[PDB]
Automatic annotation (TrEMBL):
GO MF: DNA helicase activity; metal ion binding; nucleotide binding
Record-annotated DNA helicase Pif1-like DEAD-box helicase domain positions: 2-208
SUPFAM superfamilies: P-loop containing nucleoside triphosphate hydrolases (SSF52540)
Name this polypeptide is given: PIF1 helicase
Length: 436
DNA sequence: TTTTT
């Protein structure tokens, strides 16, 4: 059963007709477990989404993009080219028209344009433009001290800056129309058997520099990444590639390389997986795209069973089933202000065809937000770059003995967004309503 | 840098 404070938030959300709620609290407080209780209460009437594939699977839902069929690009504000309602007889329209509750987990990683598109898509599909989210009761769960939304430095950043003032979900203009009720969780459930670890992460969350010095003196163990049962977390994908290639060297399978087809402008830093992707049987991998048939999803973990020319078999950890993987296509979209109109336009400039597979003995910290891991080693690589990155990497485990780091961390590496300090301040009053 | 399709 749930804890005292989780059940209090359960009743606060289900016993009132208010249409917008946020359940928020530190890492491991039980938000997604409370989400489980909400799914069973609501059962068929609620849709569960999340921004990332790993979080969606952790929430037992799907990604926001794949539910609304949003394209993987900047969703311009109420733009018909970007937010397209489903057809008159489509299965998705029936789902949107009948839906009564939308549950959105890991809302801290939902960018502001994504949240605004969900609002507008629901209003347009349900034919209710006057009501926020088209009259659906939205239940948001997440932590703004965890990872900030991903914002590439194109004209996207300028456009998000001009339209909303920043990238976070609480900067959406829909909060000018409806008040967001905030309910808070405080007790760590993940670190419940290790109360001094839980208190260390609390002080780390407040930015305590003695908690960092305590962490460094206790958790810095360079060889910790080679111990069995250990998931390695890195800030960057290229850093995970070099660590994965080391564990792959030790596998006795005969290797096979999967050669990507690249066309047009598509630079290597933008590749979702290596262009010369080499794999062996038994290798640990994560899948990067959703199956059109529904057998696997972006974020599924599993191991390689068979490797053939343009097809391989993967044994999924999620359900112990065997799925066959084929090449997918990724587009590279860029935005130009050309030339002196008052708008920017997206354009496809390159494509990347490759198996949607990547080795997963080491993952990015982004792909780990939401997970409880048995043992983690943080490889700092060339350093942290994202608000909340460090805190997510440290809060995945239940006990301090389950956590190691490749090097000590200086306090000058801690990042803080002032947008999150005003938000965290105002929502202590139990309410968030956006001004102006 | 990172995510989404
Ligand atoms: N009431 C509870 N009793 C026992 N274990 C719990 C409870 N709530 C959560 N957990 C466990 O604690 C861990 C973290 O909970 P989770 O819901 O994933 O927190 P969050 O979503 O805030 O990170 C998971 O292993 C979960 O199963
Ligand atoms: F939702 Al979390 F750690 F905050 F899984
Ligand atoms: Mg969670």
């Amino acid at each position: 059963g749930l804890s005292s404070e989780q059940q209090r938030a359960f009743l606060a959300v289900t016993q009132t007709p208010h249409p917008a709620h946020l359940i928020t609290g530190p890492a491991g407080t039980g938000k997604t477990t409370l989400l489980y209780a909400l799914q069973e209460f609501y059962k068929g009437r609620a849709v569960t989404l999340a921004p990332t594939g790993t979080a969606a699977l952790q929430a037992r839902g799907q990604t926001v993009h794949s539910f609304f069929r949003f394209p993987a690009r900047l969703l311009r504000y109420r733009h018909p080219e970007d937010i397209r309602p489903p057809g008159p007889h489509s299965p998705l329209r029936k789902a949107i028209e009948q839906m009564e509750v939308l549950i959105l987990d890991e809302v801290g990683m939902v960018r502001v344009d994504l949240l605004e598109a969900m609002d507008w898509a629901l209003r347009k599909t349900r034919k209710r433009l006057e009501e926020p989210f088209g009259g659906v009761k939205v239940l948001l769960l997440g932590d703004t001290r965890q990872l900030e939304p991903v914002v590439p430095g194109g004209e996207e950043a300028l456009y998000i800056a001009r339209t909303w003032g920043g990238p976070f979900f609480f900067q959406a203009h829909v909060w000018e129309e409806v008040a967001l009720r905030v309910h808070r969780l405080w007790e760590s459930q993940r670190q419940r058997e290790d109360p001094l670890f839980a208190e260390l992460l609390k002080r780390l969350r407040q930015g305590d520099p003695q908690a960092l010095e305590t962490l460094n003196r206790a958790a810095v163990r360079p060889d910790g990444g080679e111990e069995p049962g250990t998931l390695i977390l890195t800030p960057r994908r290229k850093e995970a590639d070099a660590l994965n290639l080391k564990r792959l060297e030790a596998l006795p399978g005969k290797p096979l390389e999967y050669q990507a087809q690249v066309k047009g402008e598509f630079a290597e830093t933008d590749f979702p997986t290596e262009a010369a992707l080499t794999l062996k049987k038994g290798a640990q991998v994560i899948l990067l795209r959703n199956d059109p048939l529904g057998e696997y999803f972006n974020g599924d973990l599993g191991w390689v069973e068979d490797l053939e020319a343009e097809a391989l078999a993967v044994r999924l950890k999620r359900n112990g089933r065997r799925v066959v993987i084929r090449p997918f296509v990724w587009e590279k979209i860029v935005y130009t202000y050309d030339s002196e109109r008052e708008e920017i336009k997206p354009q496809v400039v390159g494509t990347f065809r490759q198996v949607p597979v990547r080795l997963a003995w080491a993952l990015t910290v982004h792909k780990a937000q939401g997970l409880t891991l048995d043992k983690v080693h943080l490889e700092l690589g060339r350093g942290l770059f994202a608000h909340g990155q460090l805190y997510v990497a440290l809060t995945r485990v239940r006990r301090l003995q389950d956590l190691s780091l490749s090097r000590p961390i200086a306090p000058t590496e801690l990042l803080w967004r002032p947008e999150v300090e005003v938000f965290e301040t105002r929502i202590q009053e139990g309410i968030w309503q956006k001004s102006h």
